[PDB]
Design a protein around this ligand. Structure first.
Ligand SMILES: O=S(=O)(Nc1nncs1)c1ccccc1
Length: 167
């Protein structure tokens, strides 16, 4: 038993909710919250901008030190950093950005990072400002992640479409 509440069960291991990932993280304090990161860990907008704002910019300060030491992530890659006030850890995962021309086949590689963590609270990867077909993102998630993933989907209309169209 875990602390996640109000989720629809899609599969043995994938759960979905019409909830604010920021508000959900603040309520649950999960072991891992996933950020929809870019390779520079520049948390300007979308999920990343919202998570970073909720940390009072501490996520960005930590991330700038990480990049100054290690250089950029790979598209499809990840790093584990602090979860600050939101979670124990933040798994920063880089899905491909369609609005930058990145290979959508890298979405499966992105979701494979989730398998290193037993339980995660996560954004549908490459949805919102990343612009990938979202329905597609949920299918890759279900077909790739084997650990227990709680997908907080804040956009309501989209939530209802994801549920209604789910095979
Ligand atoms: O793309 S979002 O930034 N995803 C997020 N989920 N939780 C917090 S932000 C977003 C923000 C506002 C409305 C709809 C979507």
């Amino acid at each position: 038993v875990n602390s996640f509440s109000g989720y629809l069960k899609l599969t043995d291991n994938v759960y979905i909710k019409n909830a604010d990932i920021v508000e959900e993280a603040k309520k649950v304090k999960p072991t891992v919250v996933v950020n929809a990161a870019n390779v520079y860990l520049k948390h300007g907008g979308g999920v990343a901008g919202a998570l970073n704002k909720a940390t009072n910019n501490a996520m960005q300060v930590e991330s700038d030190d990480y990049i100054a030491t290690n250089g950029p992530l790979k598209v499809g890659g990840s790093c584990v950093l602090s979860g600050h006030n939101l979670a124990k850890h933040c798994l920063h995962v880089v899905g491909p950005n369609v609005n930058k021309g990145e290979d959508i086949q890298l979405l499966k590689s992105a979701y494979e990072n989730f398998n290193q963590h037993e339980v995660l609270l996560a954004p549908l990867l490459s949805a919102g400002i990343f612009g990938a077909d979202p329905i597609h993102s949920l299918r890759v998630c279900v077909d790739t992640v084997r650990t227990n993933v709680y997908l907080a989907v804040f956009d309501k209309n989209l939530y209802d479409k994801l549920v209604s169209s789910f095979l």
